[PDB]
Protein backbone atom coordinates (compact mmCIF):
# COMPACT_ATOMS: atom_id res chain seq x y z
CA UNK A 1 0.00 0.00 0.00
CA UNK A 2 1.20 3.49 -0.86
CA UNK A 3 -0.06 5.98 1.71
CA UNK A 4 -1.12 9.51 0.92
CA UNK A 5 0.76 12.08 3.04
CA UNK A 6 -2.28 13.15 5.04
CA UNK A 7 -3.55 9.59 5.17
CA UNK A 8 -0.35 8.46 6.91
CA UNK A 9 -0.29 11.49 9.21
CA UNK A 10 -3.78 10.62 10.47
CA UNK A 11 -2.89 6.93 10.82
CA UNK A 12 0.33 7.69 12.72
CA UNK A 13 -1.60 9.96 15.07
CA UNK A 14 -4.01 7.09 15.72
CA UNK A 15 -0.99 4.89 16.34
CA UNK A 16 0.26 7.33 18.97
CA UNK A 17 3.36 8.72 17.30
CA UNK A 18 2.65 12.38 18.00
CA UNK A 19 5.22 13.44 20.62
CA UNK A 20 6.31 9.87 21.41
CA UNK A 21 9.81 10.08 22.92
CA UNK A 22 9.78 13.83 22.32
CA UNK A 23 9.36 13.57 18.55
CA UNK A 24 6.50 15.49 16.89
CA UNK A 25 4.25 13.83 14.30
CA UNK A 26 5.84 15.63 11.36
CA UNK A 27 9.07 13.75 12.00
CA UNK A 28 7.43 10.38 11.40
CA UNK A 29 5.60 11.40 8.24
CA UNK A 30 8.78 12.97 6.85
CA UNK A 31 10.76 9.86 7.78
CA UNK A 32 8.31 7.59 5.93
CA UNK A 33 8.43 9.87 2.88
CA UNK A 34 12.20 9.67 2.49
CA UNK A 35 12.70 6.14 3.82
CA UNK A 36 10.06 4.38 1.69
CA UNK A 37 8.11 7.08 -0.17
CA UNK A 38 5.05 6.02 1.84
CA UNK A 39 5.22 2.46 0.43
CA UNK A 40 4.44 -0.24 3.00
CA UNK A 41 5.94 -2.98 0.80
CA UNK A 42 9.28 -1.23 0.23
CA UNK A 43 12.40 -3.34 0.78
CA UNK A 44 16.09 -2.62 0.28
CA UNK A 45 18.93 -5.13 0.40
CA UNK A 46 22.04 -3.81 2.14
CA UNK A 47 25.75 -4.59 1.80
CA UNK A 48 26.03 -6.54 5.06
CA UNK A 49 23.36 -8.91 3.78
CA UNK A 50 20.62 -7.33 5.89
CA UNK A 51 17.41 -5.90 4.43
CA UNK A 52 15.41 -2.78 5.33
CA UNK A 53 11.67 -3.48 5.53
CA UNK A 54 8.47 -1.50 5.22
CA UNK A 55 7.22 2.04 5.44
CA UNK A 56 9.97 2.88 7.95
CA UNK A 57 12.66 0.65 6.45
CA UNK A 58 13.35 -1.40 9.58
CA UNK A 59 16.64 -3.35 9.40
CA UNK A 60 16.91 -7.15 9.65
CA UNK A 61 20.30 -7.17 11.38
CA UNK A 62 19.17 -5.34 14.51
CA UNK A 63 15.37 -5.10 14.64
CA UNK A 64 13.38 -7.83 12.88
CA UNK A 65 14.10 -11.42 11.90
CA UNK A 66 13.86 -12.35 8.23
CA UNK A 67 15.91 -15.49 8.79
CA UNK A 68 18.46 -14.43 6.17
CA UNK A 69 20.77 -12.04 8.02
CA UNK A 70 24.12 -12.98 9.71
CA UNK A 71 24.27 -11.42 13.18
CA UNK A 72 20.52 -10.84 13.49
CA UNK A 73 19.54 -9.68 16.99
CA UNK A 74 15.77 -9.26 16.48
CA UNK A 75 15.51 -6.43 19.03
CA UNK A 76 11.86 -5.90 18.10
CA UNK A 77 11.09 -9.58 18.63
CA UNK A 78 9.16 -9.80 15.36
CA UNK A 79 9.39 -11.32 11.86
CA UNK A 80 10.32 -8.80 9.17
CA UNK A 81 7.33 -9.93 7.11
CA UNK A 82 5.06 -8.30 9.71
CA UNK A 83 6.62 -4.96 8.77
CA UNK A 84 5.55 -5.41 5.14
CA UNK A 85 1.83 -5.23 5.92
CA UNK A 86 -0.55 -2.52 4.69
CA UNK A 87 -1.48 -2.32 8.39
CA UNK A 88 1.22 -0.16 10.02
CA UNK A 89 0.67 -1.55 13.54
CA UNK A 90 3.81 -3.70 13.70
CA UNK A 91 6.05 -1.12 12.03
CA UNK A 92 4.92 1.52 14.53
CA UNK A 93 5.35 -0.82 17.53
CA UNK A 94 8.90 -1.56 16.41
CA UNK A 95 9.70 2.05 15.50
CA UNK A 96 8.78 3.04 19.05
CA UNK A 97 11.27 0.55 20.49
CA UNK A 98 13.95 1.74 18.06
CA UNK A 99 13.46 5.43 18.88
CA UNK A 100 13.48 4.68 22.61
CA UNK A 101 17.23 4.08 22.38
CA UNK A 102 19.49 7.05 23.03
CA UNK A 103 20.12 7.35 19.30
CA UNK A 104 16.49 8.35 18.77
CA UNK A 105 15.40 8.93 15.19
CA UNK A 106 19.02 9.00 14.03
CA UNK A 107 18.45 5.29 13.37
CA UNK A 108 16.67 6.43 10.21
CA UNK A 109 19.34 7.58 7.76
CA UNK A 110 16.91 9.19 5.31
CA UNK A 111 15.29 11.04 8.21
CA UNK A 112 18.71 12.30 9.32
CA UNK A 113 19.62 13.44 5.82
CA UNK A 114 16.30 14.91 4.68
CA UNK A 115 14.18 15.67 7.76
CA UNK A 116 16.30 16.55 10.78
CA UNK A 117 16.77 20.31 10.84
CA UNK A 118 13.89 21.03 8.46
CA UNK A 119 10.35 22.30 9.05
CA UNK A 120 8.97 18.82 9.72
CA UNK A 121 5.62 20.27 10.80
CA UNK A 122 5.03 21.05 7.13
CA UNK A 123 4.45 17.33 6.59
CA UNK A 124 1.20 17.32 8.57
CA UNK A 125 0.12 20.81 7.56
CA UNK A 126 -2.92 21.06 5.28
CA UNK A 127 -4.35 17.76 6.52
CA UNK A 128 -7.65 16.72 8.10
CA UNK A 129 -6.40 15.09 11.30
Amino acid at each position, epitope marked *: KVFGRCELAAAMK*R*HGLDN*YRGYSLGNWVCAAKFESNFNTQATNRNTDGSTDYGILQINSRWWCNDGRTPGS*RNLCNIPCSALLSSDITASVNCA*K*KIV*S*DGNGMNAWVAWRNRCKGTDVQAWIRGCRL
Partner: antibody
Amino acid sequence: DVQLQESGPSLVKPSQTLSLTCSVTGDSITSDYWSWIRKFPGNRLEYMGFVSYSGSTYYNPSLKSRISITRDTSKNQYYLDLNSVTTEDTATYYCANWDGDYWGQGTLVTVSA
Amino acid sequence: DIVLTQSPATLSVTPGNSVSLSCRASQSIGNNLHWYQQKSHESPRLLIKYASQSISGIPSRFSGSGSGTDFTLSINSVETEDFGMYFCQQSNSWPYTFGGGTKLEIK
Protein backbone atom coordinates in the same frame (compact mmCIF):
# COMPACT_ATOMS: atom_id res chain seq x y z
CA ASP B 1 12.62 -19.61 25.43
CA VAL B 2 13.46 -16.70 27.75
CA GLN B 3 13.69 -16.81 31.55
CA LEU B 4 14.54 -13.97 33.96
CA GLN B 5 15.44 -14.30 37.63
CA GLU B 6 16.38 -11.78 40.31
CA SER B 7 18.99 -12.51 42.97
CA GLY B 8 20.62 -10.50 45.73
CA PRO B 9 20.25 -9.62 49.44
CA SER B 10 16.75 -9.48 50.90
CA LEU B 11 17.84 -7.31 53.82
CA VAL B 12 19.91 -4.12 53.66
CA LYS B 13 20.79 -1.30 56.03
CA PRO B 14 19.96 2.39 55.60
CA SER B 15 22.55 4.35 53.60
CA GLN B 16 24.04 1.30 51.89
CA THR B 17 23.92 0.34 48.23
CA LEU B 18 21.26 -2.18 47.27
CA SER B 19 22.52 -4.40 44.44
CA LEU B 20 20.37 -6.86 42.51
CA THR B 21 21.20 -9.14 39.60
CA CYS B 22 18.85 -10.35 36.88
CA SER B 23 19.98 -13.50 35.15
CA VAL B 24 18.68 -14.00 31.62
CA THR B 25 18.51 -17.50 30.15
CA GLY B 26 17.38 -18.44 26.66
CA ASP B 27 18.86 -15.60 24.62
CA SER B 28 21.53 -12.91 24.77
CA ILE B 29 20.99 -9.74 26.78
CA THR B 30 22.32 -7.99 23.69
CA SER B 31 19.02 -8.82 21.99
CA ASP B 32 16.61 -6.72 24.06
CA TYR B 33 16.11 -3.62 26.24
CA TRP B 34 16.20 -4.37 29.98
CA SER B 35 14.20 -2.82 32.81
CA TRP B 36 13.77 -2.65 36.58
CA ILE B 37 10.40 -2.06 38.23
CA ARG B 38 9.46 -2.07 41.91
CA LYS B 39 6.30 -2.34 43.97
CA PHE B 40 6.04 -0.44 47.25
CA PRO B 41 4.02 -1.70 50.27
CA GLY B 42 1.02 0.37 49.21
CA ASN B 43 0.46 -1.56 45.98
CA ARG B 44 2.22 1.31 44.20
CA LEU B 45 4.35 0.44 41.18
CA GLU B 46 7.34 2.49 40.02
CA TYR B 47 9.21 2.15 36.75
CA MET B 48 12.82 2.56 37.86
CA GLY B 49 14.58 2.58 34.51
CA PHE B 50 15.89 0.61 31.57
CA VAL B 51 19.00 0.14 29.46
CA SER B 52 18.72 -0.11 25.68
CA TYR B 53 20.87 -2.02 23.17
CA SER B 54 23.31 0.89 22.72
CA GLY B 55 23.98 1.20 26.44
CA SER B 56 21.91 4.34 26.82
CA THR B 57 19.93 4.41 30.05
CA TYR B 58 16.73 6.02 31.27
CA TYR B 59 16.36 6.53 35.00
CA ASN B 60 13.31 7.74 36.90
CA PRO B 61 13.91 11.28 38.23
CA SER B 62 12.29 10.08 41.46
CA LEU B 63 15.51 8.17 42.18
CA LYS B 64 17.58 11.37 42.40
CA SER B 65 20.53 9.83 40.53
CA ARG B 66 20.89 7.05 43.10
CA ILE B 67 20.34 4.39 40.45
CA SER B 68 22.66 2.66 38.02
CA ILE B 69 21.75 -0.08 35.52
CA THR B 70 24.60 -2.01 33.90
CA ARG B 71 25.03 -5.20 31.87
CA ASP B 72 27.52 -8.06 31.56
CA THR B 73 27.34 -10.01 28.30
CA SER B 74 29.79 -12.76 29.28
CA LYS B 75 27.49 -13.75 32.16
CA ASN B 76 24.28 -12.73 30.38
CA GLN B 77 23.03 -10.70 33.35
CA TYR B 78 22.15 -7.08 33.99
CA TYR B 79 22.20 -5.24 37.28
CA LEU B 80 20.53 -2.71 39.52
CA ASP B 81 22.52 -0.59 41.94
CA LEU B 82 20.56 1.77 44.17
CA ASN B 83 22.73 3.88 46.46
CA SER B 84 22.01 5.47 49.84
CA VAL B 85 18.81 3.50 50.45
CA THR B 86 16.30 4.46 53.15
CA THR B 87 13.29 2.64 54.58
CA GLU B 88 11.46 4.30 51.68
CA ASP B 89 13.21 1.86 49.34
CA THR B 90 11.66 -1.21 50.95
CA ALA B 91 9.85 -2.91 48.08
CA THR B 92 9.49 -5.90 45.79
CA TYR B 93 11.94 -5.51 42.91
CA TYR B 94 11.30 -7.01 39.46
CA CYS B 95 13.39 -7.26 36.33
CA ALA B 96 11.62 -7.45 32.99
CA ASN B 97 12.31 -6.79 29.34
CA TRP B 98 11.16 -3.47 27.88
CA ASP B 99 8.30 -5.13 25.97
CA GLY B 100 6.88 -6.34 29.27
CA ASP B 101 6.38 -9.93 28.10
CA TYR B 102 9.28 -11.37 30.13
CA TRP B 103 9.33 -10.84 33.90
CA GLY B 104 11.35 -12.15 36.82
CA GLN B 105 9.61 -13.54 39.90
CA GLY B 106 10.27 -10.41 41.93
CA THR B 107 12.30 -10.25 45.12
CA LEU B 108 11.40 -8.44 48.33
CA VAL B 109 14.15 -6.22 49.69
CA THR B 110 13.66 -4.73 53.13
CA VAL B 111 15.63 -1.73 54.33
CA SER B 112 15.98 -1.82 58.11
CA ALA B 113 18.41 -0.68 60.79
CA ASP C 1 5.31 13.49 35.11
CA ILE C 2 2.20 12.01 33.54
CA VAL C 3 -0.29 10.98 36.22
CA LEU C 4 -2.56 7.99 35.64
CA THR C 5 -5.77 7.81 37.66
CA GLN C 6 -7.59 4.51 37.94
CA SER C 7 -11.18 3.94 39.02
CA PRO C 8 -12.89 2.41 40.71
CA ALA C 9 -10.19 1.64 43.28
CA THR C 10 -12.04 -1.59 44.05
CA LEU C 11 -14.67 -3.53 42.15
CA SER C 12 -16.57 -6.60 43.35
CA VAL C 13 -18.20 -8.89 40.82
CA THR C 14 -19.76 -12.33 40.49
CA PRO C 15 -18.06 -14.72 38.06
CA GLY C 16 -19.92 -14.70 34.77
CA ASN C 17 -20.60 -10.98 34.87
CA SER C 18 -18.57 -8.45 32.93
CA VAL C 19 -16.69 -5.38 34.14
CA SER C 20 -14.78 -2.38 32.80
CA LEU C 21 -11.87 -0.62 34.51
CA SER C 22 -10.96 3.03 33.91
CA CYS C 23 -7.59 4.78 33.53
CA ARG C 24 -7.37 8.51 32.85
CA ALA C 25 -4.13 10.34 31.99
CA SER C 26 -3.18 13.85 33.13
CA GLN C 27 -2.31 14.71 29.51
CA SER C 28 -2.70 13.05 26.12
CA ILE C 29 -0.66 9.90 25.55
CA GLY C 30 -2.10 8.80 22.21
CA ASN C 31 -2.38 5.01 22.28
CA ASN C 32 0.60 4.48 24.56
CA LEU C 33 -1.31 2.93 27.46
CA HIS C 34 -0.76 -0.67 28.59
CA TRP C 35 -2.64 -2.94 30.96
CA TYR C 36 -1.18 -5.30 33.54
CA GLN C 37 -2.71 -7.88 35.85
CA GLN C 38 -1.02 -8.77 39.14
CA LYS C 39 -1.88 -11.35 41.78
CA SER C 40 -0.32 -11.85 45.22
CA HIS C 41 3.18 -13.36 45.23
CA GLU C 42 3.35 -12.81 41.47
CA SER C 43 4.97 -10.45 38.98
CA PRO C 44 2.80 -8.28 36.69
CA ARG C 45 1.43 -9.83 33.49
CA LEU C 46 0.89 -7.74 30.34
CA LEU C 47 -2.71 -8.11 29.11
CA ILE C 48 -3.12 -5.39 26.48
CA LYS C 49 -0.49 -3.21 24.85
CA TYR C 50 -0.92 0.15 23.14
CA ALA C 51 -4.50 0.72 24.30
CA SER C 52 -6.20 -2.08 22.37
CA GLN C 53 -3.65 -4.51 20.93
CA SER C 54 -4.16 -8.09 22.09
CA ILE C 55 -1.37 -10.26 23.48
CA SER C 56 -0.73 -13.88 22.47
CA GLY C 57 -1.46 -16.23 25.36
CA ILE C 58 -3.98 -13.94 27.09
CA PRO C 59 -7.67 -14.90 27.32
CA SER C 60 -9.85 -13.39 24.59
CA ARG C 61 -12.25 -12.01 27.21
CA PHE C 62 -9.81 -9.14 27.86
CA SER C 63 -10.04 -6.12 25.58
CA GLY C 64 -8.77 -2.55 25.74
CA SER C 65 -10.23 0.68 24.38
CA GLY C 66 -9.49 4.39 24.36
CA SER C 67 -7.07 7.05 23.17
CA GLY C 68 -5.78 10.42 24.32
CA THR C 69 -6.54 10.65 28.04
CA ASP C 70 -9.36 8.15 28.59
CA PHE C 71 -8.84 4.39 28.52
CA THR C 72 -10.68 1.29 29.69
CA LEU C 73 -9.93 -2.40 30.13
CA SER C 74 -12.95 -4.67 29.71
CA ILE C 75 -13.38 -8.24 30.90
CA ASN C 76 -16.23 -10.09 29.19
CA SER C 77 -17.53 -12.68 31.67
CA VAL C 78 -15.15 -12.56 34.63
CA GLU C 79 -13.67 -15.87 35.77
CA THR C 80 -12.26 -16.71 39.21
CA GLU C 81 -8.76 -16.67 37.71
CA ASP C 82 -9.31 -12.95 36.99
CA PHE C 83 -9.46 -11.69 40.57
CA GLY C 84 -6.40 -9.64 41.45
CA MET C 85 -4.92 -6.20 40.76
CA TYR C 86 -5.06 -4.32 37.46
CA PHE C 87 -2.67 -1.51 36.56
CA CYS C 88 -2.40 0.75 33.53
CA GLN C 89 0.96 2.13 32.45
CA GLN C 90 1.89 4.85 29.96
CA SER C 91 4.99 4.87 27.76
CA ASN C 92 4.31 8.11 25.88
CA SER C 93 6.79 10.03 28.03
CA TRP C 94 9.67 9.12 30.32
CA PRO C 95 9.44 8.42 33.15
CA TYR C 96 6.93 5.69 32.35
CA THR C 97 4.26 5.75 35.04
CA PHE C 98 1.62 3.43 36.50
CA GLY C 99 -1.91 4.08 37.68
CA GLY C 100 -2.79 3.42 41.31
CA GLY C 101 -4.52 0.17 40.39
CA THR C 102 -7.99 -1.34 40.61
CA LYS C 103 -8.64 -4.41 42.73
CA LEU C 104 -11.09 -6.91 41.24
CA GLU C 105 -12.63 -9.30 43.76
CA ILE C 106 -15.50 -11.77 44.09
CA LYS C 107 -18.71 -10.18 45.37
